[PDB]
Amino acid sequence: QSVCAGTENKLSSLSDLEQQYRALRKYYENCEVVMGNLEITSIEHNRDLSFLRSVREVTGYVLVALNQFRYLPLENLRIIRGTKLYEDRYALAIFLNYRKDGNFGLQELGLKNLTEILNGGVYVDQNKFLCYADTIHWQDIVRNPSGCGRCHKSCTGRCWGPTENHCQTLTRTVCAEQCDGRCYGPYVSDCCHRECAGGCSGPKDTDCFACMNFNDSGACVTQCPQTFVYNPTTFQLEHNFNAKYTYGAFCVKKCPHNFVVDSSSCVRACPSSKMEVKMCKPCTDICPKACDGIGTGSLMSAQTVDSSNIDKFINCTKINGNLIFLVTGIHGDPYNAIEAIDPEKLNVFRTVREITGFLNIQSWPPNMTDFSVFSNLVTIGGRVLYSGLSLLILKQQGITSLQFQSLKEISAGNIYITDNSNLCYYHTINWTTLFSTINQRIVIRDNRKAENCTAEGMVCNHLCSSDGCWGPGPDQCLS
Numbered sequence: 001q002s003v004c005a006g007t008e009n010k011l012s013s014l015s016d017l018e019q020q021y022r023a024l025r026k027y028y029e030n031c032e033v034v035m036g037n038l039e040i041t042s043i044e045h046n047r048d049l050s051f052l053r054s055v056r057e058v059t060g061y062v063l064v065a066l067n068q069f070r071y072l073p074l075e076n077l078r079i080i081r082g083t084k085l086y087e088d089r090y091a092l093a094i095f096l097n098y099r100k101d102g103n104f105g106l107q108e109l110g111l112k113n114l115t116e117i118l119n120g121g122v123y124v125d126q127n128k129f130l131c132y133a134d135t136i137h138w139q140d141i142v143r144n145p146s147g148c149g150r151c152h153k154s155c156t157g158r159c160w161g162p163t164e165n166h167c168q169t170l171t172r173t174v175c176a177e178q179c180d181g182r183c184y185g186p187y188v189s190d191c192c193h194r195e196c197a198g199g200c201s202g203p204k205d206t207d208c209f210a211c212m213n214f215n216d217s218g219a220c221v222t223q224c225p226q227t228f229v230y231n232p233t234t235f236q237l238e239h240n241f242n243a244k245y246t247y248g249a250f251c252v253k254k255c256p257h258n259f260v261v262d263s264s265s266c267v268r269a270c271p272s273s274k275m276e277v278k279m280c281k282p283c284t285d286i287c288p289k290a291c292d293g294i295g296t297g298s299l300m301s302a303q304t305v306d307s308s309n310i311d312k313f314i315n316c317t318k319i320n321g322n323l324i325f326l327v328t329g330i331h332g333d334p335y336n337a338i339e340a341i342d343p344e345k346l347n348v349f350r351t352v353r354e355i356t357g358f359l360n361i362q363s364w365p366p367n368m369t370d371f372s373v374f375s376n377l378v379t380i381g382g383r384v385l386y387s388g389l390s391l392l393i394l395k396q397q398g399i400t401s402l403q404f405q406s407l408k409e410i411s412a413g414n415i416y417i418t419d420n421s422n423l424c425y426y427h428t429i430n431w432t433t434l435f436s437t438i439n440q441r442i443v444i445r446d447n448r449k450a451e452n453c454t455a456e457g458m459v460c461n462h463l464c465s466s467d468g469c470w471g472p473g474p475d476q477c478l479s
C-alpha cells in the first residue's frame, strides 16, 4: 500500500496553471492513502487526471473547486475519514467547477466506490455542468445522520453517471435492523463486522473494504495490539510480540523513517510541551529549541542583537553560535532605519540555557542593572572565541550585579569583566568553579571597589557557599 502527504492550500494556486497541474500530479500520482487532504483546484479543461485512480482513501478532506475538466476519475476512492475538515465543516467539498464564457466544467463524478465519510458534511454547489450527483443519497455515505441525463433503469434513481455500471451502491440504509454497521445485501446474514468501513465482501473483520479505526495485517481492529496483553490464566500483563504503533489508520511494527513515537502513535514530530528522546517524553526543563546565534546560518551576516533580529530568539534554549550586544544594536543604527532595542524585548533570552560560542556585552540598556534576562543560562561553550574570550562585559555604568543565577559552566576561553564602575558581587565569585580547564583565566579591572561594595552592603546571602554570588538574595548563590 502506497502512502503520501496531502496539501493545506485550500483555494490557493500557482499562477501558471500548467504548474498547478504538475504539482497535483507530483503530490498524488501512485498514492493510495492520502495522509492529509486531497485538494484538486484550478485545473484546466484538457488535463489527464486518470492518475487519481490510485487513491483509495483520504484521511482529511477532499476539496474539488474552480476546476474545468469534464470528469473526476476517483473510481477507487472508498473512504474520506474527515480527521481535518474543509473550513472545519466538510469532508467532501465540490464547488465552482466551471469557467465563465466557455462550456467547460465538471460534468460527472467518478465516485462509485465512495461509500464512507466518517466525519464532516458534504457540499456540492455551483457546478454549472454537473450531472447525476443530485440523485445521490449522501445519507447512506455520511455516517453522522442545466439539462441533464437520466440514471439507468437499474440504478433505481440513484447514480453517479448514465450507465448500468454507474449506480450508487447502498451499504447502510438497505441493511437489516440487526446490523451494527454496513452490509453487503439486505438479509440478516449480510451484516459486515462492526469494524468494517465502506462495506464488506463477507462477515469477518478481514473482509472489509476499509477499516473504521485501525488495520492490523488485513484485519480491522478497534485499537492496535498493545505492548502488554492481559493473560486471564496467569493474571499478569505478558509482553506482546505482535505489538504495533498507530500510523493513521494503520498498525505498524516500525514507524516510517525520521518519525517519533508519541503515546503509542507514529508522528512527524513531538507535540507542544513534549520532547524527542525516538520517543516523546514530557519536558524536563523548558522544551529544547536550538537556535542560530549571531554569525551562524540565518544570522550569518548579523553583527549584534538588534530590533530587526531579536524575535529570531523567541523560545530558544540552546544558541548555536554567539550572542553579541553592540552600541548599534542597543542604541539603534542611525545609518540604516534600525531603531534602538525595546529593552523589555531582551526578556526573550530567559529561555536560553546554553550559548555554544561566546557572550559579548559591549552595550546594555542603561536602565537595566543586571543580566537577569540570562537567569537560566547554564553553559557558555566558548567553542568559538572573541580574542580568546568567551565572556566579555565591558564599560557598563548601568550594571549593579551580574545575576547569571544558573551559570554553572564556562567550557572554554577567558572572562573579561571590565570598567563596570557600579558593578558589585563580581569579586565574591570563585570563577575557578565554572572553568572546565587549567588555562582559563579572568581579566577583572576597574569595576566597583570590593571594599566600597562591602561598606554599602553589597554582600552575599548567609546561605551561599565560599564560592560567592551573582547578586543579592538567596537565589543568587553559586553553591
Ligand SMILES: *[C@@H]1O[C@H](CO)[C@@H](O)[C@H](O)[C@H]1NC(C)=O
Pocket: 075, 076, 113, 209
Ligand atoms: C472498488 O471496491 C472494490 C471492493 O474493495 C474493489 O474490488 C475494486 O477494485 C474498486 N472498484 C472499482 C469498480 O474500481
Ligand SMILES: *[C@@H]1O[C@H](CO)[C@@H](O)[C@H](O)[C@H]1NC(C)=O
Pocket: 001, 207, 208, 209, 210, 211, 215, 216, 217, 218, 219, 220
Ligand atoms: C489492511 O492492510 C492490508 C495489508 O496486510 C491491505 O492489503 C488491505 O487493503 C487493508 N484492508 C483494509 C480493509 O483496509
Ligand SMILES: *[C@@H]1O[C@H](CO)[C@@H](O)[C@H](O)[C@H]1NC(C)=O
Pocket: 314, 315
Ligand atoms: C513560544 O512558546 C510559547 C509557549 O511556551 C507559545 O505561546 C508561543 O506562541 C511561542 N512563540 C512563537 C513566536 O512561536
Ligand SMILES: *[C@@H]1O[C@H](CO)[C@@H](O)[C@H](O)[C@H]1NC(C)=O
Pocket: 342, 343, 344, 367, 368
Ligand atoms: C527601561 O527603559 C525603557 C525605555 O528606555 C522602557 O521600555 C522600559 O519599560 C524600562 N524598564 C522597566 C520600566 O521595567
Ligand SMILES: *[C@@H]1O[C@H](CO)[C@@H](O)[C@H](O)[C@H]1NC(C)=O
Pocket: 449, 452
Ligand atoms: C570608597 O569610598 C570613598 C569614600 O566615600 C570614595 O572615595 C570612593 O568611592 C571609594 N574609594 C576608592 C579608593 O575608590
